[PDB]
Amino acid sequence: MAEQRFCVDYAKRGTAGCKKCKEKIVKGVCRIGKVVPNPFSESGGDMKEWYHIKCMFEKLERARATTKKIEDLTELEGWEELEDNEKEQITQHIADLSSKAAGTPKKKAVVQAKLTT
Ligand SMILES: [Zn+2]
């Protein structure tokens, strides 16, 4: 019994504490909604939560490899509403989280840049 539903939506109004981090989702942040059935209450059948772009993608890097979630940039209900510019930012996360395509094997890479305008 493995049923998992994921959706893509953008923040519209109000702030919500994202899961897996000490932050909140405010207008201007894109979040994915995961609808899973919880075997505990009868009224609360399936619940959905919003995540950040690094929190949801960071969980995949730590989650087990045998199971994969969210493949490519066209396997979720919501990316169509997003815009081409915003879609490019989401594709970069999967390319950095997956990497290794032809000749670029890299592991554990972090950079700290500070620019002011
Ligand atoms: Zn977060």
CATH code at 76? 3.30.1740.10
Is 105 a domain residue? Answer: no
Residue 50 lies in a domain: yes
Q: Is 93 annotated as a binding residue?
A: no
CA distance 22 to 20: 7
Identify residue 27 by its one-letter amino acid code: K
Asked whether residue 58 is assigned to any structural domain, the reply reads: yes
Token pair belonging to 55: 């929190």
How far does the centroid of ligand 1 lie from the alpha carbon of residue 103, in Å? 32
Give distance in angstroms: CA of 32 to centre of ligand 1.
11
Q: What is the DSSP letter of 109?
A: -
Cα of 4 vs centre of ligand 1, distance in Å, is: 20
Range of the domain at 89: 4-99
30 annotated among ligand-binding-site residues? no
**108 in a domain, yes or no?**
no
Helix axis angle, 84-98 relative to 53-62, nearest 10°? 20
Q: How was this structure obtained?
A: NMR
- For residue 3, give both structure tokens: 């049923």
Does a structural domain hold residue 29? Answer: yes
Does the annotation flag 7 for ligand binding?
no
Residue 112 resides in a domain: no
Q: Is residue 94 a contact partner of residue 73, using CB atoms and an 8 Å limit?
A: yes
Question: Has residue 113 been placed in a domain?
Answer: no
How far apart CA 37 and CA 21 sit, in angstroms, is 23
Give the Cα separation of 113 and 40 in Å (integer). 45
User: Nearest-CA neighbor of 97 among 69, 78, 74?
Assistant: 69
